[PDB]
Amino acid sequence: KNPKSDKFKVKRFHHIEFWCGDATNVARRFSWGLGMRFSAKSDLSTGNMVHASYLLTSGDLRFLFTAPYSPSLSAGEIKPTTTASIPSFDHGSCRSFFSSHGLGVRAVAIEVEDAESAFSISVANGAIPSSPPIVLNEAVTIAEVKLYGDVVLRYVSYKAEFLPGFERVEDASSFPLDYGIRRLDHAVGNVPELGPALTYVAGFTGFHQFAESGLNSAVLASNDEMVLLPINEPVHGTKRKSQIQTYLEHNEGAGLQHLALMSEDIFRTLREMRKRSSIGGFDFMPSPPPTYYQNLKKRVGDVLSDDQIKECEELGILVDRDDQGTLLQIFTKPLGDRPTIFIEIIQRVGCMMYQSGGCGGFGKGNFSELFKSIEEYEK
Amino acid sequence: KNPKSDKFKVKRFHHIEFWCGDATNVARRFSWGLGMRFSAKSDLSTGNMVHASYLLTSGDLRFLFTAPYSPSLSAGEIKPTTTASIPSFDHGSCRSFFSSHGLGVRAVAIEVEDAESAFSISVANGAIPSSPPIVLNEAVTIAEVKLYGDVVLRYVSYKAEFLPGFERVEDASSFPLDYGIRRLDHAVGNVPELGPALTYVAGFTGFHQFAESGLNSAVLASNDEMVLLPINEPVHGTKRKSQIQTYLEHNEGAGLQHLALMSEDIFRTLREMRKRSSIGGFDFMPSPPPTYYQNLKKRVGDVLSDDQIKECEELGILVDRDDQGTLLQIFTKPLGDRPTIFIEIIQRVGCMMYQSGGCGGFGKGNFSELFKSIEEYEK
Ligand SMILES: Cc1c(C(=O)c2c(C3CC3)[nH]n(C)c2=O)ccc2c1c(=O)n(CC1CC1)c(=O)n2C
Ligand SMILES: Cc1c(C(=O)c2c(C3CC3)[nH]n(C)c2=O)ccc2c1c(=O)n(CC1CC1)c(=O)n2C
Ligand SMILES: [Co+2]
Ligand SMILES: [Co+2]
């Protein structure tokens, strides 16, 4: 069931912010690898003496890449006189974040009706404040609370172009790449203990819980179930070591594990991304064995044709089925040096009337199907 | 003249090492932007719990990209029991380097006959030791001395595959990109005071000095003038602010300013790089005005045809002339967030009998030619 218990009005995912040591190189690699266009910047060329921030967009998906400049450039500034376009930015926090975790997500940003209200109600309901509400050029308000580890939930509200102080990039520099990615479907955290993490986040948002190998997890969802925030914990004591525990070890604790990006055509997206894997883009996890694709006919043969299921086989796409929809999904290798953050590409089919959130689930059934296919490929 | 005063036997440039916060993303961006292949790795997959290091190669050019892992992965190790493939690596030095300077060159590595001898003679002649000689698997010896700022000169000698502990990357991951770059021609440092820097470096190497707008510079060279190490200082008090001083400000002091990469066909290299500028590669400095290319006929018309000089005009190539050879050159925009390090692409024509080093100079004459062309394009 869906009690619609959101303690404030939540709209959609707004952006994901990566904290890096060099925003330029990460943003260029991601743009080519994922087919995202350069759309806005805030940096020295725009008067920002504090941080370099570059925004990539594909459909409604917004990826922001930020790194600190030398603190010496802004030594004369005080918070009232700052040239930073994102007032929550702090040199010491950013350098500490990146040296501790490496490349990763700092902020999961959701658009709300009123960011100051969302912040107040959140903290009144247990949220740990991270950055108080600040109004930007009488137009946009942003506030931040702690989510898990060093990741924050960022509230953004607009009265009536990304953020004040960001400039649109010249289209000579803005090449219209597009591989079909259209929006952020869900953002997943890894924590040591799932119980306290769930109680905390569900406590200050009012998100409700949305309807065996390595992990336990649960999905918090907004009223219309379009902001989806799953959380995982490790399952210790197994033959194979939990990838959640490996994450916590290499990340130095809790953090964002994967971003799932919805594509309007996952076959085109994966053809385009795989073309670029070895020339600067992203690698994908190893494909499942043919026994997997042999056994799909008897499970999804009603939704996908024999050509398409074979087209899944070339690209290594996995498929899972809910009682309401079907899910196409595939996972990249880790995005940076450490075995921590990765990306999932997904497409959902079903649950129409617009599409309802979570249609098809998150692919939990693909674990035992993978195990069964591996047990059957040695035969 | 060339006194051939090298205090030890120096061969050629061996590699350039970048210290980064995420080696993966920088190495992938550089590989696509410059047309360099992935050739070796030392990381978690090879047993290195200390640093991730990825090597790119194009012809004889070797770019190494290194970043630290969490120190927790190697907390039980001592220097005798280290899994680091580069024993000079230090987590604290690397994090301090990158937070201070951002993305930049840590090591300029030259191949010598005997790295222990080169280190001893260097320090006996004033070099500041950085890392003592260490023998790797009874096969390779590496030692490091301070060069300028936080940049070190790294000596490498081989008894008889990059370094012990590096693995060749699977050719499924190794795409054979090549845009024509073949070797490192020179590596240039920026310092506050040129005099003391020259006296220091020439003092411990025996390199000799190799034969007005913003800078003073001088070029130290090895016996055969194939290791070329120019150094710049700012010229203060001008109408336009020195780019050397801007470098020192944004870099937090002295460091490596530019790498010049020789191409066997600069026209093909710049066509290939410019195709990729807006899809993840490198941007170039603004092209000179047509008045420049109008005035080349009367200076290089004897070496380049009218088609090629027009082909220079499309690509924005600059041309300068020595009394012994001619030089084709162009500069990228800065490689990362800060206005610090950039790359020069060059091709030299002349001085044959093999090609002698520095053929054509370094393009000093292109300053006044550029000024004159700008004064003549408003007419
Ligand atoms: C991350 C993930 C998901 C997934 O996206 C989500 C889950 C799954 C319950 C985990 N719950 N929620 C909310 C999700 O968004 C689904 C299937 C997967 C994996 C995955 O990582 N590996 C490789 C790692 C195990 C070695 C797999 O083999 N399979 C089959
Ligand atoms: C770096 C550089 C070089 C060059 O490579 C080297 C030099 C030159 C004396 C500087 N000496 N040595 C040893 C060299 O390797 C040559 C010409 C240049 C520039 C350059 O940066 N800019 C733009 C900056 C000035 C605003 C220019 O307009 N011109 C024309
Ligand atoms: Co998922
Ligand atoms: Co040069």
Swiss-Prot record, chains A, B:
Pathway: Amino-acid degradation; L-phenylalanine degradation; acetoacetate and fumarate from L-phenylalanine: step 3/6; Cofactor biosynthesis; prenylquinone biosynthesis. Its EC number is 1.13.11.27. GO terms for biological process: L-phenylalanine catabolic process; tyrosine catabolic process. Residues 12-158, 183-333 form the VOC domain. The keyword Amino-acid biosynthesis does not apply. It catalyses: 3-(4-hydroxyphenyl)pyruvate + O2 = homogentisate + CO2. It is found in: Cytoplasm. Keywords: Cytoplasm, Dioxygenase, Iron, Metal-binding, Oxidoreductase, Phenylalanine catabolism, Repeat, Tyrosine catabolism. The keyword NADP does not apply. One of its GO terms (molecular function) is 4-hydroxyphenylpyruvate dioxygenase activity. It holds the Pfam family Glyoxalase. Fe cation binds at H186, H258, E344. Binds 1 Fe cation per subunit. One of its GO terms (cellular component) is cytoplasm. Gene3D superfamilies: 2,3-Dihydroxybiphenyl 1,2-Dioxygenase, domain 1. Its cofactor is Fe cation. Homodimer. Belongs to the 4HPPD family. Catalyzes the conversion of 4-hydroxyphenylpyruvic acid to homogentisic acid, one of the steps in tyrosine catabolism. This is 4-hydroxyphenylpyruvate dioxygenase. It comes from Arabidopsis thaliana (Mouse-ear cress).
